[PDB]
Amino acid sequence: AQNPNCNIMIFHPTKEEFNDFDKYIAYMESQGAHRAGLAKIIPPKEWKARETYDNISEILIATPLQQVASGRAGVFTQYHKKKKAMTVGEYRHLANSKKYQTPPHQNFEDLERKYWKNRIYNSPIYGADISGSLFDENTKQWNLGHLGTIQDLLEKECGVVIEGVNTPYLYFGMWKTTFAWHTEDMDLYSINYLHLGEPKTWYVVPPEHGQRLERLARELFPGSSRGCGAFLRHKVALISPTVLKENGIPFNRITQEAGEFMVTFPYGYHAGFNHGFNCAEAINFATPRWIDYGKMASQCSCGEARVTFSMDAFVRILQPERYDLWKRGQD
Ligand SMILES: O=C(O)CNC(=O)C(=O)O
Ligand SMILES: [Mg+2]
Ligand code: NI
Ligand SMILES: [Zn+2]
């Protein structure tokens, strides 16, 4: 069995190997990458996402989210307070302001310490889930807006024909902006490219141990657990590495830098935070190996998780028994 300790693997594809996306995902899996839940892909030196970023301040963040925490430093939830629209230029200036900027620090480890110590005492503002792409249309390799769609994968594998589309999203982060512990919708893969700016630290639980994390989460958030049998779908709960280690939950950590891709694998729980102003792009995708995870994915039916249009068909086809209840939670 490859990668039995479920370590995060880092890949350095050549330009030739970067041509065929699906093939390279399958390659990484042949080496056991998926067992970690997360992999890093460093593009060949000859590749570029786009020529420059010199013109990104005009993008609009229609609904910036202030991430307000409740709990204790290592175990907290966050809610998103909607703020008034702002441009990327406005947001970048805010990120760099004394109130929100990254503190002095020695190295990534010191900064991680400061994050876990102090996150809860601040409410950073996140520009998340903005439909769009910053890849140049002429970038042919690993262009997140030119991937094969999840609908087409399900059609190819299963023969059914469904509505729905699959487009990328932009994320504009600042110091302490936080992504809570989650898997993807329908336990899909995700791919994330850090276009520019400061790093993003990731934590991940191996898919084969995801239920260990869920059990701890039920213990740590007992009211939330009573409200919903899949409340990590709400994407609001944080648990620190110290707490995970105290409770024997297997995990790994890695820091993604600008110019790097990360892939999350089906049912790989992940969480993390941004080091300072940055911009990432991400999208869900599927492979044949996903289909079995899609069929088994938990679902939130309490109404909190509310998701895209395109998830309807996935539930309807892969989880017909669950469809009626889940759709009530959508409606
Ligand atoms: O970048 C972020 O804030 C969150 N991204 C993801 O959870 C992902 O790419 O799957
Ligand atoms: Mg612009
Ligand atoms: Ni994710
Ligand atoms: Zn729920």
Residue 60 DSSP class = E
DSSP 126: E
Total number of residues shown for the chain:
331
DSSP string of 168-193, one letter each residue: -EEEEE-TT-EEEEEPPGGG-EEEEE
Tell me how crowded residue 51 is: count the other CB atoms within 10 A of its CB: 9
Contact 11, 28 (CB under 8 A): yes
Q: Which helix (H) or strand (E) holds 271?
A: strand 269-274
Q: Name the residue with tokens 């786009």.
A: 50
Q: Ligand 1, residues 264, 275, 277: which to mutate, most atoms within 8 A of Cβ?
A: 264
H helix or E strand, kind and range, residue 27: helix 21-30
Cα torsion 213, 218, 219, 223 to 10°: value is 150
Residue (of 123, 144, 113, 126) closest to 50 by Cα position: 144
* H-run or E-run covering 71: strand 65-72
Find residue 285's DSSP bridge partners: 189
Query: Separation of 13 CA from ligand 4 center, angstroms?
Result: 39
Answer left, alpha or beta for residue 119, where phi above 0 means left and psi between -120 and 50 means alpha. Answer: alpha
Q: What angle do CA 11, 48, 50 make, to 5 degrees?
A: 140
Helix (H) or strand (E) holding 40, with range, is: strand 38-41
* CA–CA separation, 101 and 68 (whole Å): 17
SS3 content of the chain, % helix, strand, coil (to 5): 30, 25, 45
Question: Cα–Cα distance between 154 and 318 in angstroms, integer?
Answer: 10
Ligand 1, atom 4: closest residue by C-alpha: 179
Q: Please give the structure tokens belonging to residue 29.
A: 């899996």
181 vs 106: CA distance, rounded Å: 27
Count of other CB atoms within 10 angstroms of residue 128? 18
Approach to solving: X-ray
Task: Please classify residue 328 by burial: count the beta carbons closer than 10 Å to its beta carbon, then call 0-12 exposed, 13-18 middle and 19+ buried.
Answer: exposed
The Å distance, Cα 176 to ligand 1 centre, comes to 14
Q: Which mutation among 196, 270, 277, 281 tests ligand 1's pocket best, with the greatest number of atoms within 8 A of CB?
A: 270
Three-state SS for 137?
coil
> At residue 212, what is the residue type?
R
CB 286 within 8 A of CB 153: yes
Tell me the C-alpha distance between 37 and 130, whole Å.
25
Q: Which helix (H) or strand (E) holds 291?
A: helix 290-296
Which DSSP helix (H) or strand (E) runs through 129? strand 125-131
Residue 166 per-residue DSSP state: -
197 CB-side CA count, 13 A: 24
Distinct helix (H) and strand (E) counts, the chain: 10, 16
* Fold entry, domain 1-331: Jelly Rolls (2.60.120)
Q: Where are the domains of the chain?
A: 1-331
Residue 290 buriedness (CB in 10 A; 0-12 / 13-18 / 19+): buried
**Could you tell me the CA-to-CA distances from 293 to 68, 187, 217, 307 in Å, in that order?**
32, 6, 21, 18
Closest atom, ligand 1, to C-alpha of 191: 9
Residue ranges of alpha helices (H) inside 103-246 are: 108-118, 150-158, 210-220, 222-227, 241-246
In sequence order, which residues have a C-beta less than 8 Å from that of residue 219 and are 6 or more positions away?
Answer: none
Q: Which of 23, 287, 294 is nearest to 153 (CA)?
A: 287
